[model samples]
Target: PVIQTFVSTPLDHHKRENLAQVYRAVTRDVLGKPEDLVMMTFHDSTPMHFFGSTDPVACVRVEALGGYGPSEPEKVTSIVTAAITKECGIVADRIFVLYFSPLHCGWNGTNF
Candidate 1:
């Protein structure tokens, strides 16, 4: 379950930290994820940021969605959307998930 999010401005450490907090909170408390295996990462906008209504972009993982799955994990996905929107106050469309097989890509993505 991949989600997408957009921002009209840049986010600071406090915002990043808060997002991390929300991620874990959702993963553990809401999604019932194990505290130890909180698998995720953020892909941020580059340094050559555009100067306009949108300053930067931020991303965080929602699900792994593979080898260990059958159907889309709605519980965790819902929690991710709800948590990011509620806690991070980002638009629901701005959040997204990253994917690739461990055997085929080992988490980095294809053809790399």
Candidate 2:
């Protein structure tokens, strides 16, 4: 599973670290996966816009096996939103997440 987060400027190391921790913990505890299995990529200081404003926003794109189920999407959204809010000082509404399951992904000489 991968959680790819994109953000604009000023999300320093401390904030990014916290967000990563939260992502790992949430995915493990809530999503029922090994903490070490969670892979993340953060795109910091990238030019981005939201709602016609550039006020510290973050968007997460998650592609994983446990993609969608009843209430699961909302759970992931809520967790990521809170992490960005607390760590980056970005409001919950400023965060967006798109979750999906790829039918196929290549890795280690095989497709999963």
Candidate 3:
């Protein structure tokens, strides 16, 4: 399972740190995903321009084998958007979240 967050705006140490905290807590606690299985990465300083302008924005991508409920995206987006807005000062309207899941994943020369 992987949760990768890309922030178009530059994130300092404090903001980045808090962002990770929020990511982990929300992913593991609220989303009920295994902490050991969750792999997360933050792509800061992304060169992404949204709404025809280079404003502070964010985009999140999620990939996992399973565990996506029908309403999971909306629930996760609400929490993630709130955290980004509060910690990074990016407006909720500017943030975008996308979820992806593969039917199967191959690793160690075998499909899992």
Per-residue lDDT tens digits of candidate 1, residues 51-105?
2334333344444334334333555566656655665565665555343334332
TM-score against truth, every candidate: 0.46, 0.87, 0.83
Q: Which candidate number has the best TM-score?
A: 2
Report lDDT (CA) for all predictions.
0.48, 0.81, 0.81
Q: Kindly list the per-residue Cα lDDT of model 3 for residues 36-112, writing each as its tens digit.
A: 66677888888888899888899988787875877777888899899889987889889998888888977668987
Compute the lDDT of residue 14 as modeled in candidate 2.
88
Which parts of model 1 have CA positions greater than 4 angstroms off? 1-9, 29-33, 46-59, 62-72, 98-101, 104-112
- Compared with the true structure, the alpha-carbon lDDT of candidate 1 equals 0.48
Give the per-residue lDDT digits (tens) of candidate 2, residues 38-112.
Answer: 788889887888899887888889888746668777888888888787777778777889888878777678886
Model 3 lDDT on a 0 to 1 scale: 0.81
Worst 10 residues of 1 by lDDT: 48-57
**Candidate 3: residue 77 lDDT (0-100):** 88
